[PDB]
């Protein structure tokens, strides 16, 4: 961003785009700090983007506490993605990268429908 | 109902997807003269689910509209636009003499008369290589034995019916981002009737529930994996599903 | 810019001997030479086009060779009716058909048919408009070209309009720009030519012939070695009118 | 083959409907054309393209093509609306199929002249010509529809505007010769080996489209008709 | 397509390996040929038939084809072993596919003369000839390998020793017309309608076998090369 207020330094050119989405509601939000987690998958037809924004106060590492991620957008695009990479801006940069495994869990649902705890059987 | 289409050698095929296709507004744009639907049915298109629908526009002669069909050749069918045997798409044609015919003649629409070979189907070539016909080499210059590959139509309003501009739109179907306009109905009161909430098929009585669904769910199951609650995807409101008597 | 001049001027070779025809040029022209053999009073007749193959109609007494900046045509037969001027025309520059001063040789010392119109006195009412209606080939699929023939000066270029296929543009010479405007009426198998602002030097005999066949699909299948290329894609001269000027 | 009831009824002041069904290859895919022929005259096109009407026919007639069936709604029928209505369609076998005819009984310039009749000689030969002048015969196409005395319309043949594709009916397929003369502006139909079972008039109809009915499946229609010649084919 | 690493490295005194994998239609069914081209010179055959080497190449080089992949082992590399190595395989689809090139970077008579260059005229015509004398041209076959500046080797066409069946590449088929003369002992290549992406040298390669590589899938190999002519095809 030079300070319009943006650029396209990621790519050099374009081609036959097969899918596009405006998605006016932004995923990443803004303003005790704030932690945002994102879960991405590779389902046959959907991408299943999960997100959740919770305030944190320890500011050391991933805090202790059970928080679920509500689904936001399920892009109906089929593609074999085997590589990903984050993006950073210029005018602190901590980001975690985990790995999903087929594990058995026992989800506990509250009276209002929110998940309060889970149990990894393995 | 655009302003200016391309020629017959080019396609300008704009792919349409990611939206529901309503095949009922095209009948309220302009009076068509040819509504061939090779492969499918004109009425039976708002029910199938396709993945990628392509749409091209071009202007070709009126005498040669019957030549744009699967398994049929012609003058402009081996070099500029070919329909293969797996081509199942509706070919909509309509005259446009009132908009693409000037008294002094228009030479903006071009067509190829003969290539070096037959072009393969589902292919588009915009090469402007000057044709090389003879026993003497042509160095990319217009001479005697060297001919241009592109020829103009020359549409005029004084010409009779048949040599007029005909905007023919080739709509294709290929194989789920584009579907048909699923029509809804009216929600009845508490009575054991049939219901279908986006695939949820079953019987039961729809009664006013008191649950509070989170703003990312539609239906819900009981302790024995039985659907007994759903939210109408028309207006935010919970609905209990009790089994029929 | 390519000047084509003939070396012989007056050959009085009696029939029963050989005859040579040399034609040079400044710019190195490829195999695009057209040889005409025109009787005095009648219409010109092409002998060998593009200096590569012969025409149709003339006998086999036209064996020649050569390519580039020189051409040759050795006639090893007698001269029964060789009382005609042997010209030369280039086919390289399409909108710049240029002729040359032919050599006058003497004895000692068919559905293709077209008519023309437009002529007479030119000084009173300085407006002459020649017309060209053909009854041979299908009028319309071939471009319409014009050529004038001044008395005792040789063959000359006028202008042309391309056929209906390859656009409706135009291209004229330097001495006819802004004065000679050609209009085509292929809907009625007629081609017109307006000659506004006429002078005393424009008293030549104009001729309308054929030009390139914009339809080329057939020309690739049949090889230009027989009468077919002469029947489909070939220009043929016709009759011409007269222009009279006075004070 | 199309099912159509023989006759309907209606009172002056009410709107009635005339239904005419067809298979999924003639109405479900092609268009329906309605015609009306007063007793003793030539038919005329009323509704074409299922949504349009010519300038001669007023807006009092309504039409609609819903799925694989057709309907002819006559809003406010008058005392002059007493005639027979026929249907029109194009099947996949390249044929102009008709309906059955509806005898509506109430309870209250372009010229196409054709000649040729008299002795038909069922087993010899007969020449039939149709004149045409004043409507740009080189552009508009033609038709061939015969009508037996007391029966409905029978499709014979049709030619495009360019003089190309023509289609024959199963009963006379491969025996006639339909061709036109763009220089003389006349239409001919040579008939050979005719039986004693084809007593009709062979009305010379004028088409409004250009090409064959297989490609232009949204513009075909017989606007202008003519006075046919009643044949006398017998033993 | 033959998978090959872009560049390898090694110290003087150790043995390095150069692998080149491929499908079972080109390597698994045929033999692999290794080549070495110093910067600014012509390539040369190193290992043929996956188990033999010519007299010019010493026994220090090793080659082996295990299954559907090959390997080039250079035992005891010296300071002069700094060049690019390409793979060679003849697929059953009548095409000669090369590798990608391995830029080995260290950390320490028979004459084929060809002419024809200068003005390329991309759109006209161009004749390319290659002389041959001193190796029994009537027996050994010939090849045509082009190399763009900064790119790898690309096969153009092939001609048998008997002058019978000939083949071209998938991108040059239909435009070139090859020719040869057994009496004059010369190789020709008539080219027409050259595009702007044909900038190369067109090396005149000499085969060691007799028939085309499709029938003799265990003896083909380009032993002697020539000095190609750099074309200047541009706008």
Which DSSP string do the residues of B138-167 spell out, in sequence order? --SS--SSEE-SEEE--B-TTS-TTSS-EE
- The phi-psi region of residue E60 (left if phi > 0; otherwise alpha if psi is between -120 and 50; otherwise beta) is alpha
Output the DSSP codes for C19-80. Answer: ----EEESS---S-EE-BEE-SSS---B-EETTTEE-SSS-S---EE--SSEEEE---S--S
Question: In the beta sheet, which residues pair with residue E190?
Answer: E127, E177
Are B26 and B16 a contacting pair, CB within 8 Å? no
Given the structure tokens 């994998």, which residue do they identify?
E21
Give just the sign of the alpha carbon dihedral E1, E3, E9, E12.
Answer: negative
Please tell me whether residue B67 adopts helix, strand or coil conformation.
Answer: helix
Nearest residue to E198 (alpha-carbon basis) of E141, E149, E125:
E149
Q: Tokens representing E220?
A: 């083909």
Are C203 and C122 a contacting pair, CB within 8 Å? yes
User: What DSSP state is assigned to residue B52?
Assistant: B
Tell me the residue ranges of DSSP E strands in chain D.
9-10, 16-21, 34-37, 44-47, 61-66, 69-74, 84-86, 88-91, 95-98, 102-103, 105-106, 114-115, 125-126, 129-131, 144-147, 153-157, 177-181, 186-192, 206-207, 222-224
Torsion of CA B185, B189, B195, B196, to 10 degrees: 50
Given the structure tokens 């292929």, which residue do they identify?
C186
Nearest residue to E141 (alpha-carbon basis) of E228, E59, E221:
E221
CA angle A18, A20, A24 (to 5 degrees): 175
Neighbouring chains to C with at least 3 Cβ pairs closer than 8 Å: B
A112–chain B Cβ distance below 8 A for any pair: yes
**Entry resolution in angstroms?**
3.8
Please tell me whether residue E73 adopts helix, strand or coil conformation.
Answer: strand
For A61, B30, D43, D59, D224, the CA distances from D62, given in Å and listed in that order, are 76, 20, 18, 7, 21
A20–chain B Cβ distance below 8 A for any pair: yes
Q: Tokens representing A58?
A: 């320890």
Nearest residue to C155 (alpha-carbon basis) of C211, C209, C234:
C209
Residues in chain B within 8 Å Cβ distance of A21: 18
Residues in chain B within 8 Å Cβ distance of D206: none
Give exposure, E83-122, as e/b (b: 16+ Cβ within 10 Å).
bbbbbbbbbeebbbbbbbbbebeeeeeeebebebeeebeb
- Interface A–B counts its CB contacts (< 8 A) at 23
Residues in chain E within 8 Å Cβ distance of B117: 174
Residues in chain D within 8 Å Cβ distance of B42: 28-29
Neighbouring chains to E with at least 3 Cβ pairs closer than 8 Å: B
Neighbouring chains to A with at least 3 Cβ pairs closer than 8 Å: B
D219–chain B Cβ distance below 8 A for any pair: yes
- Which of B27, B42, B160 minimises the CB distance to D139? B160
Nearest residue to D120 (alpha-carbon basis) of D197, D42, D186, D179:
D197
Rounded CA-CA distance E202/E189 in Å is 10
Are C162 and C107 a contacting pair, CB within 8 Å? no
Burial of D210 (0-12, 13-18, 19+ CB in 10 A): buried
Rounded CA-CA distance D230/D222 in Å is 20
Residues in chain D within 8 Å Cβ distance of B30: none
Nearest residue to D216 (alpha-carbon basis) of A29, B63, B197, C7:
B63
- Which of A19, A45, A70 minimises the CB distance to B216? A70
Rounded CA-CA distance C52/C64 in Å is 9
Rounded CA-CA distance B66/B36 in Å is 10
Segment 179-208 of chain D within 8 Å of chain B by CB = none
Residue C159: phi and psi, rounded to 5, are: 170, -175
Nearest residue to E223 (alpha-carbon basis) of E132, E140, E148, E154:
E140
In angstroms and rounded to an integer, the radius of gyration of the C-alpha atoms of chain E is: 18
User: What DSSP state is assigned to residue D124?
Assistant: S
Given the structure tokens 């990894």, which residue do they identify?
A120
Residues in chain D within 8 Å Cβ distance of B32: 218
Q: Tokens representing E181?
A: 């003369």
Are B170 and B36 a contacting pair, CB within 8 Å? no
Q: How many residues does chain B have?
A: 245
How crowded is residue C56: how many other Cβ atoms within 10 Å of its Cβ? 12
Please tell me whether residue C231 adopts helix, strand or coil conformation.
Answer: helix
Nearest residue to B88 (alpha-carbon basis) of B62, B50, B57, B46:
B50
Q: Tokens representing E146?
A: 């082009």
Rounded CA-CA distance A42/C5 in Å is 81
B210–chain A Cβ distance below 8 A for any pair: no
Do chain C and E touch: 3 or more Cβ pairs under 8 angstroms?
no
Give just the sign of the alpha carbon dihedral B153, B156, B160, B161.
Answer: positive
Question: In the beta sheet, which residues pair with residue E187?
Answer: E130, E180
Q: Tokens representing D200?
A: 């009709």
Rounded CA-CA distance E229/E115 in Å is 6
Please tell me whether residue D180 adopts helix, strand or coil conformation.
Answer: strand
B34 membership: H or E segment, kind and range? strand B34-37
Are C33 and C50 a contacting pair, CB within 8 Å? yes
Torsion of CA D138, D140, D144, D149, to 10 degrees: -120
Q: Residue B159's closest chain C neighbor by CA?
A: C187
Question: In the beta sheet, which residues pair with residue E64?
Answer: E71
D67–chain B Cβ distance below 8 A for any pair: yes
CA angle E185, E189, E190 (to 5 degrees): 130
Are B30 and B1 a contacting pair, CB within 8 Å? yes
Torsion of CA B172, B175, B181, B183, to 10 degrees: 140
Nearest residue to C209 (alpha-carbon basis) of C57, C34, C61, C2:
C34
Rounded CA-CA distance D150/E76 in Å is 108
Are E118 and E127 a contacting pair, CB within 8 Å? no
Burial of D224 (0-12, 13-18, 19+ CB in 10 A): buried
Indicate yes or no: CB of C219 within 8 angstroms of CB of B133.
yes
Q: Residue B114's closest chain C neighbor by CA?
A: C217
Rounded CA-CA distance B133/C223 in Å is 10
CA angle E122, E128, E132 (to 5 degrees): 165
Burial of A110 (0-12, 13-18, 19+ CB in 10 A): exposed
Rounded CA-CA distance D38/D103 in Å is 10
Burial of B219 (0-12, 13-18, 19+ CB in 10 A): middle
Instruction: Tally DSSP H helices, then E strands, for chain D.
Output: 0, 20
- Which of B35, B41, B160 minimises the CB distance to D217? B35
Indicate yes or no: CB of D140 within 8 angstroms of CB of B42.
no
Rounded CA-CA distance B148/C150 in Å is 34
Are C37 and C44 a contacting pair, CB within 8 Å? yes
Rounded CA-CA distance B214/E95 in Å is 62
Indicate yes or no: CB of A20 within 8 angstroms of CB of B18.
yes
- Which of D28, D140, D215 minimises the CB distance to B41? D28
């Amino acid at each position: 961003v030079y300070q319009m207020e943006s650029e396209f330094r990621v790519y050099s050119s374009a081609n036959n785009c097969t899918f596009e989405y405006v998605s006016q509601p932004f995923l990443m939000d803004l303003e005790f700090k704030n932690l945002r987690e994102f879960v991405f998958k590779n389902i046959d037809g959907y991408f299943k983007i999960y997100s959740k924004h919770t305030p944190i106060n320890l500011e050391r590492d991933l805090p202790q506490g059970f928080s679920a991620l509500e689904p936001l957008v399920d892009l109906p695009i089929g593609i074999n993605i085997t590589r990903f990479q984050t993006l950073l801006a210029l005018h602190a940069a901590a980001y975690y990268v985990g790995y999903l495994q087929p594990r058995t869990f026992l989800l506990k649902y509250n009276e209002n429908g929110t998940i309060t705890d889970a149990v990894d059987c393995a | 109902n655009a302003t200016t289409f391309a020629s017959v050698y080019a396609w300008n095929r704009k792919r349409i997807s990611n939206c529901v296709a309503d095949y009922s507004v095209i009948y309220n744009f302009a009076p068509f003269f040819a509504f061939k639907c090779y492969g499918v049915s004109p009425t039976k298109l708002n029910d199938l689910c396709f993945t990628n629908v392509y749409a091209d526009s071009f202007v070709i002669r009126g005498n040669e509209v019957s030549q744009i069909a699967p398994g049929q050749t012609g003058n402009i069918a081996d070099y500029n636009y070919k329909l293969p045997d797996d081509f199942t798409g509706c070919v909509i044609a309509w005259n446009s003499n009132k908009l693409d015919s000037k008294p002094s003649g228009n030479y903006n629409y071009l067509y190829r008369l003969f290539r070096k070979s037959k072009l393969k189907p589902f292919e588009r070539d915009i090469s402007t290589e000057i044709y090389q016909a003879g026993n003497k080499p042509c160095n990319g210059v217009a001479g005697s034995n060297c001919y241009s590959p592109l020829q103009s139509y020359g549409f005029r309003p004084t010409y009779g019916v048949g040599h007029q501009p005909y905007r023919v739109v080739v709509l294709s179907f290929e194989l789920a981002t584009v579907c048909g306009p699923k029509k809804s109905t009216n929600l009845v009161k508490n009575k054991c009737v049939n219901f279908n909430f986006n695939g949820l098929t079953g019987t039961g009585v729809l009664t006013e529930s008191n649950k509070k669904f989170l703003p990312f769910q539609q239906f819900g199951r009981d302790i024995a994996d039985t659907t007994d609650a759903v939210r109408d995807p028309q207006t935010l409101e919970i609905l209990d599903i009790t089994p029929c008597s | 810019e390519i000047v084509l001049t003939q070396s012989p001027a007056t050959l009085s070779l009696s029939p029963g001997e050989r005859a040579t025809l040399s034609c040079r040029a400044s710019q190195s022209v490829s195999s695009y030479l057209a040889w005409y053999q025109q009787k005095p009073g009648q219409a010109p007749r092409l002998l060998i086009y593009d200096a590569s193959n012969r025409a149709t109609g003339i006998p086999a007494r036209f064996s020649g060779s050569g390519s580039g900046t020189d051409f040759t045509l050795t006639i090893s037969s007698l001269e029964p009716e060789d009382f005609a001027v042997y010209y030369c025309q280039q086919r390289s520059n399409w909108p710049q058909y240029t002729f040359g001063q032919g050599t006058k040789l003497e004895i000692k010392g068919s559905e293709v048919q077209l008519v023309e119109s437009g002529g007479g006195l030119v000084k009173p009412g300085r407006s002459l408009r020649l017309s060209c209606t053909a009854s041979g080939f299908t009028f319309g699929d071939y471009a319409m070209s014009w050529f004038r023939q001044a008395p005792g000066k040789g063959l000359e270029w006028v202008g042309f309009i391309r056929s209906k296929a390859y656009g409706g543009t135009t291209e004229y010479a330097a001495s006819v720009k802004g004065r000679f405007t050609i209009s085509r009426d292929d809907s009625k198998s007629i081609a017109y030519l307006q000659m506004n602002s006429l002078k005393t030097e424009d008293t030549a005999v104009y001729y309308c012939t054929r030009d390139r066949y914009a339809r080329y699909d057939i020309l690739t299948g049949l090889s230009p070695a027989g009468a077919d290329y002469f029947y489909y894609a070939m220009d043929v001269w016709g009759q011409g009118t007269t222009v009279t000027v006075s004070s | 083959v199309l099912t159509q009831p023989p006759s309907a009824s209606g009172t002056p002041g009410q709107r009635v409907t005339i239904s005419c069904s067809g298979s999924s290859s003639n109405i479900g895919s092609n268009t329906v054309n309605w015609y009306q022929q007063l007793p003793g005259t030539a038919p005329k096109l009323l509704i074409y393209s299922n949504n349009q009407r010519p300038s001669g026919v007023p807006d009092r007639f309504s039409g609609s093509k819903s799925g694989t069936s057709a309907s002819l709604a006559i809003s406010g029928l008058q005392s002059e609306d007493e005639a027979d209505y026929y249907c029109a369609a194009w099947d996949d076998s390249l044929n102009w199929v008709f309906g059955g005819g509806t005898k509506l009984t109430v309870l209250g310039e372009v010229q196409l002249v054709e000649s040729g009749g008299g002795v038909v000689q069922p087993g010899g030969s007969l020449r039939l010509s149709c004149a045409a002048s004043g409507f740009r015969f080189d552009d508009h196409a033609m038709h061939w529809v015969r009508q037996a005395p007391g029966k409905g319309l029978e499709w014979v043949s049709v030619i495009s505007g360019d003089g190309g594709s023509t289609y024959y009916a199963d009963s006379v397929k491969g025996r006639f010769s339909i061709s036109r003369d763009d220089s003389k502006n006349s239409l001919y139909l040579q008939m050979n080996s005719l039986r004693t079972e084809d007593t009709a008039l062979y009305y010379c109809a004028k088409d409004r489209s250009y090409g064959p009915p297989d490609v232009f499946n949204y513009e075909y229609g017989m606007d202008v008709w003519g006075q046919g010649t009643t044949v006398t084919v017998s033993s």
